[PDB]
């Protein structure tokens, strides 16, 4: 209940003061981050679930935001859309519809739509898939319409940033170069590409033609420079370790491409990315499962 929440808030304030005393810091400037660090130090827990570790947050966060009963002592609900059972969702829809009406009166890249779980957390109300789809359609109709700054801010409450994903150094002799790293399977490589050179690659201190006898590995090495037409114009010193011949070739290729990105133009960097020369390959060996011959092959189902 509300009185319970008030008591929890008072207890949290007292506990915050006590924790500040315990860690020897100013209670007046003991932020939530300090509280979390102190709790993690005093009550260490290796449990992988972060929600299972000890927590002493504010009651506004520990307790669900569904709040106590939505009516006072008289029993009158606070919200006028309470009897809809989804007062948050329908209030939001009503506000969006009012915004659309006002837009009628007056007259993509780094963001995505929050998932249904995120919206449910926002409104602390359970919602159906079709309800979420209807709200998304309304929001997208709002966006497509000539939305103003206020509507853009309203949408940004639901926009979620998309997860889309170089230095130049000088040696002791003033040779401008770039250094980068790459991984492929188990092989790990570190490459150094100099700004000016005459196409000489030394792998582990050994020339590539003597270190990579297979023509395929040399072709993989040639791929980045040949893509940007810079064959024979750069000097590369790279060291690779682990894996086999092809894994090492791929790791060196990725490291060389990433390092060479420091010299080619931004459009050339984008072209290299679109060619796949910069994406770290996540294809790694899959573990063998018990009761099976291999990663995916089952044992021969016995003849019947």
């Amino acid at each position: 209940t509300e009185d319970f929440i008030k008591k929890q808030i008072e207890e949290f304030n007292i506990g915050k003061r006590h924790l500040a005393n315990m860690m020897g810091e100013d209670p007046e400037t003991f932020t939530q981050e300090d509280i979390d660090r102190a709790i993690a130090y005093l009550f260490p827990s290796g449990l992988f679930e972060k929600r299972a570790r000890p927590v002493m947050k504010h009651p506004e966060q520990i307790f669900p935001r569904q709040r106590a009963i939505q009516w006072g002592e008289d029993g009158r609900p606070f919200h006028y859309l309470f009897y809809t059972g989804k007062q948050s969702y329908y209030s939001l829809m009503h506000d969006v519809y009012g915004m659309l009406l006002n837009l009628e009166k007056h007259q993509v890249i780094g963001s995505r739509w929050l998932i249904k779980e995120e919206l449910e957390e926002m409104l602390v109300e359970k919602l159906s898939d079709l309800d979420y789809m209807q709200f998304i359609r309304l929001l997208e109709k709002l966006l497509t319409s000539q939305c103003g700054a206020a509507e853009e801010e309203f949408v940004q409450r639901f926009r979620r940033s998309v997860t889309l994903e170089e230095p130049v150094q000088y040696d002791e002799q003033g040779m401008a170069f770039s250094k980068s790293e790459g991984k492929r399977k188990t092989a790990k490589a570190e490459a150094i590409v100099y700004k000016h050179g005459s196409g000489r690659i030394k792998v582990n201190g050994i020339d590539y033609q003597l270190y990579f006898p297979i023509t395929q590995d040399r072709e993989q090495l040639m791929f980045p420079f040949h893509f940007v037409d810079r064959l024979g114009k750069h000097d590369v010193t790279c060291t690779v370790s682990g894996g086999g011949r092809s894994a090492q070739a791929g790791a060196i290729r990725l490291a060389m491409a990433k390092a060479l990105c420091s010299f080619v133009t931004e459009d050339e960097v984008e072209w290299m990315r679109q060619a796949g020369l910069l994406t770290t390959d996540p294809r790694v060996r899959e573990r063998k499962k018990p009761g099976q011959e291999g990663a995916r092959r089952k044992f021969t189902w016995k003849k019947r």
């Binding site: 890249i109 072709e219 993989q220 040949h226 037409d229 072209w271 990315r273 679109q274 796949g276 994406t279």
Partner: protein
């Protein structure tokens, strides 16, 4: 697959990226802008931007590969190309001036023409048309299976494959015979095409 569905296949073609902006259509401009924001898979270890890269030959080598022995399959393929080139050069030098115009010495052209000749236009039972990919796969598989036949004893794969490719380039050899047999069987079973 470890790649999320958001990831797109890479496009390894230097002409595509060096193409002038003016020649690009509005649709192509939108495609490029979209690709500027799309996650792209890592370039596979097989294909590169090399001007000498041949996707047909790469696929043929992959089909020849046994137990992931890409090195040996590639060695067999390059040995076959060298054998075809050497035999064609011998024929060219042993031929008169008039015949030298007709003799072809490009191993890649010979290989492509041989595979094109071996491609069966029709397939099967009810005879049915075959799509392009199925045609190419059938041609390659027929060539490889014929070259792997035990009928040739102690002859290495490069020599057998070169001989069969040269036979196919002249519209002869057991592979063309197999294609003709499939065509004749489809013609015979044409009466069942109503199924």
């Amino acid at each position: 697959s470890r790649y999320s569905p958001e990831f797109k296949d890479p496009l390894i073609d230097k002409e595509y990226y060096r193409k002038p902006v003016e020649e690009l259509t509005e649709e192509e401009k939108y495609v490029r802008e979209l690709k500027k924001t799309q996650l792209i898979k890592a370039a596979p270890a097989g294909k590169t931007s090399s001007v000498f890269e041949d996707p047909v030959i790469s696929k043929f080598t992959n089909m020849m590969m046994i137990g992931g022995n890409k090195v040996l399959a590639r060695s067999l393929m390059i040995q076959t190309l060298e054998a075809v080139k050497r035999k064609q050069f011998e024929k060219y030098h042993a031929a008169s001036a008039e015949e030298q115009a007709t003799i072809e010495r490009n191993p890649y052209t010979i290989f492509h023409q041989a595979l094109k000749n071996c491609e069966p236009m029709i397939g099967l039972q009810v005879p049915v048309p075959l799509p392009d990919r199925r045609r190419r796969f059938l041609a390659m598989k027929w060539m490889i299976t014929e070259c792997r036949d035990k009928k040739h004893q102690r002859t290495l794969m490069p020599e057998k494959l070169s001989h069969k490719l040269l036979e196919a380039f002249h519209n002869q050899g057991p592979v063309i015979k197999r294609k003709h047999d499939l065509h004749k069987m489809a013609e015979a079973n044409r009466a069942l095409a109503h199924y």
